[PDB]
Motif scaffolding. Structure first.
Motif, PDB file in Angstrom:
ATOM      1  N   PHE A   1      47.065  39.875  38.437  1.00  0.00           N
ATOM      2  CA  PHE A   1      47.922  41.057  38.390  1.00  0.00           C
ATOM      3  C   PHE A   1      47.330  42.169  37.536  1.00  0.00           C
ATOM      4  O   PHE A   1      47.859  43.282  37.501  1.00  0.00           O
ATOM      5  CB  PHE A   1      49.314  40.696  37.875  1.00  0.00           C
ATOM      6  N   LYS A   2      46.229  41.858  36.855  1.00  0.00           N
ATOM      7  CA  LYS A   2      45.512  42.820  36.018  1.00  0.00           C
ATOM      8  C   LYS A   2      46.422  43.465  34.977  1.00  0.00           C
ATOM      9  O   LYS A   2      46.506  44.688  34.900  1.00  0.00           O
ATOM     10  CB  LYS A   2      44.857  43.914  36.873  1.00  0.00           C
ATOM     11  N   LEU A   3      47.106  42.649  34.182  1.00  0.00           N
ATOM     12  CA  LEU A   3      48.055  43.179  33.209  1.00  0.00           C
ATOM     13  C   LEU A   3      47.817  42.617  31.815  1.00  0.00           C
ATOM     14  O   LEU A   3      48.763  42.383  31.066  1.00  0.00           O
ATOM     15  CB  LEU A   3      49.488  42.866  33.642  1.00  0.00           C
ATOM     16  N   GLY A   4      46.552  42.404  31.470  1.00  0.00           N
ATOM     17  CA  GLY A   4      46.204  41.824  30.186  1.00  0.00           C
ATOM     18  C   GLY A   4      46.611  42.700  29.019  1.00  0.00           C
ATOM     19  O   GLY A   4      46.767  42.221  27.896  1.00  0.00           O
ATOM     20  N   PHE A   5      46.794  43.987  29.287  1.00  0.00           N
ATOM     21  CA  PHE A   5      47.174  44.942  28.254  1.00  0.00           C
ATOM     22  C   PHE A   5      48.672  44.899  27.954  1.00  0.00           C
ATOM     23  O   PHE A   5      49.197  45.775  27.270  1.00  0.00           O
ATOM     24  CB  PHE A   5      46.744  46.356  28.651  1.00  0.00           C
ATOM     25  N   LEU A  14      48.209  46.225  44.590  1.00  0.00           N
ATOM     26  CA  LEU A  14      48.667  44.865  44.354  1.00  0.00           C
ATOM     27  C   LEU A  14      48.383  43.967  45.543  1.00  0.00           C
ATOM     28  O   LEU A  14      48.963  44.140  46.612  1.00  0.00           O
ATOM     29  CB  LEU A  14      50.166  44.840  44.043  1.00  0.00           C
ATOM     30  N   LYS A  15      47.477  43.016  45.351  1.00  0.00           N
ATOM     31  CA  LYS A  15      47.268  41.957  46.323  1.00  0.00           C
ATOM     32  C   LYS A  15      48.494  41.060  46.259  1.00  0.00           C
ATOM     33  O   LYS A  15      48.626  40.255  45.340  1.00  0.00           O
ATOM     34  CB  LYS A  15      46.019  41.157  45.972  1.00  0.00           C
ATOM     35  N   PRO A  16      49.399  41.191  47.239  1.00  0.00           N
ATOM     36  CA  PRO A  16      50.716  40.554  47.142  1.00  0.00           C
ATOM     37  C   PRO A  16      50.658  39.060  47.437  1.00  0.00           C
ATOM     38  O   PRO A  16      51.688  38.392  47.431  1.00  0.00           O
ATOM     39  CB  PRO A  16      51.515  41.272  48.227  1.00  0.00           C
ATOM     40  N   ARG A  17      49.459  38.550  47.692  1.00  0.00           N
ATOM     41  CA  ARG A  17      49.297  37.152  48.052  1.00  0.00           C
ATOM     42  C   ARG A  17      48.395  36.407  47.075  1.00  0.00           C
ATOM     43  O   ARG A  17      47.257  36.064  47.401  1.00  0.00           O
ATOM     44  CB  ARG A  17      48.761  37.024  49.479  1.00  0.00           C
ATOM     45  N   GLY A  18      48.905  36.170  45.871  1.00  0.00           N
ATOM     46  CA  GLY A  18      48.238  35.293  44.929  1.00  0.00           C
ATOM     47  C   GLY A  18      48.541  33.861  45.320  1.00  0.00           C
ATOM     48  O   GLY A  18      48.016  33.357  46.312  1.00  0.00           O
ATOM     49  N   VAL A  19      49.400  33.210  44.542  1.00  0.00           N
ATOM     50  CA  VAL A  19      49.867  31.864  44.858  1.00  0.00           C
ATOM     51  C   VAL A  19      51.192  31.593  44.151  1.00  0.00           C
ATOM     52  O   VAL A  19      52.161  31.137  44.767  1.00  0.00           O
ATOM     53  CB  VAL A  19      48.826  30.793  44.476  1.00  0.00           C
ATOM     54  N   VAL A  20      51.223  31.879  42.852  1.00  0.00           N
ATOM     55  CA  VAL A  20      52.453  31.825  42.076  1.00  0.00           C
ATOM     56  C   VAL A  20      53.486  32.749  42.713  1.00  0.00           C
ATOM     57  O   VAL A  20      54.662  32.400  42.830  1.00  0.00           O
ATOM     58  CB  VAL A  20      52.196  32.234  40.610  1.00  0.00           C
TER      59      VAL A  20
END
Length: 363
Positions: free
Chosen positions: A355-359, A24-30
């Motif tokens: 977050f790669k959670l499209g599923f 998990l790249k913990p630094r998106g923006v949201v």
């Protein structure tokens, strides 16, 4: 319209844990705006499993998560940032478990639309306790890192650096600032950050006092006044960060009496009485250690005679006390995780593509 739940196919549980916790790249923006969001995501999945009564799915979910957390911190025991992010997210998830537990106690500060998304079937109190436990473990872990990164700085700045005429006392506050900011930027609840800061202050006072208890060439009136000054500097650091002065008392009070002791004249059958009345947060062992290791460097301060030491120790007989001299740097305060509600409505929570959670699927 939406309900605030997350559908997951029970065969992607592993991949979910993988791409939401371990990877998990913990630094998106949201997430920068709202951190602890992964905790919300998790609880939405949990709410989904709870809506189905399939208990095995629920337990498997909780276990996969907790193990995923345990693991993900176990991989980064030297990453203060990550440890902060996961202590945060863990506390958030626990607070979600409490908030939507359905228990009357936690529905105090809930939106009527928030009281609509409580768990509808299972009691997860035991799990909440377990989570509190692992959270304690993580907190203990992330405290250690700060303490380890600031310990070699305490002494060289708090006293090795001579103000009253290359690190300095400022550097201490600069690191304290680094820690405070890093905590705040990770959605870490204010009270938690407060207890952490408290721990740090304890560490400072402890290393300082210990170095006093060791080095004879540090027990002087000059050094005492210097210390008291640095203490006021620290109180000012609190004021600046808008933190209570109370914690500074309940961490530095022994060091104050130590510094106060160094200055005070140590001659007359009256000084001794004042040492008794004032040094109230020190063990007699510590006091005596100072009075014996007290060496003056200036001419206005007169040296302490063995007779005076004996007088003081005789006066200390009325106070039973403790056998403690040094203050061990591995002492830890009782950490408390106060329940703080979440302002966010699950019904309007959406997953960033980062977050790669499209599923998954919002219900």
């Amino acid at each position: 319209e939406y309900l605030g739940m997350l559908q997951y196919k029970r065969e992607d549980e592993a991949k979910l844990i993988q791409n939401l916790i371990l990877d998990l790249k913990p630094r998106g923006v949201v997430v920068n705006m709202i951190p602890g969001l992964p905790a919300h995501i998790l609880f939405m999945c949990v709410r989904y499993a709870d809506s189905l009564n399939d208990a095995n799915m629920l337990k498997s979910l909780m276990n996969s998560t907790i193990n995923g957390i345990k693991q993900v911190v176990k991989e980064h025991l030297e990453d203060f940032e990550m440890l902060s992010f996961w202590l945060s997210n863990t506390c958030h998830f626990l607070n979600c478990l409490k908030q939507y537990s359905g228990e009357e106690e936690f529905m105090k500060h809930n939106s009527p639309q928030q009281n609509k998304n409580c768990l509808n079937n299972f009691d997860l109190s035991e799990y909440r306790q377990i989570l509190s436990d692992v959270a304690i473990r993580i907190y203990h872990q992330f405290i250690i890192i700060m303490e380890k990164n600031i310990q070699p700085i305490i002494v060289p700045g708090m006293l090795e650096y001579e103000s009253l005429q290359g690190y300095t006392m400022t550097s201490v506050l600069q690191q304290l600032s680094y820690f405070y900011t890093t905590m705040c930027q990770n959605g870490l609840d204010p009270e938690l950050v407060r207890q952490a800061v408290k721990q740090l202050f304890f560490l400072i006072g402890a290393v300082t006092l210990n170095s006093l208890f060791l080095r004879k060439d540090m027990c002087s009136c000059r050094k005492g006044m210097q210390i008291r000054c640095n203490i006021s500097y620290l109180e000012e650091w609190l004021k600046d960060k808008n933190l209570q002065n109370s914690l500074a008392k309940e961490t530095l009070e022994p060091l104050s009496q130590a510094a106060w002791l160094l200055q005070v004249k140590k001659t007359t059958d009256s000084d001794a009485k004042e040492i008794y009345e004032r040094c109230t947060s020190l063990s007699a062992v510590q006091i005596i250690k100072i009075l014996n290791s007290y060496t003056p460097i200036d001419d206005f301060e007169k040296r302490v005679t063995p007779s005076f030491v004996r007088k003081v120790q005789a006066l200390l007989n009325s106070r039973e006390d403790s056998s403690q001299l040094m203050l061990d740097t591995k002492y830890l305060f009782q950490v408390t995780f106060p329940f703080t509600p979440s302002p966010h409505a699950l019904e309007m929570i959406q997953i960033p593509s980062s977050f790669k959670l499209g599923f998954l699927n919002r219900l």
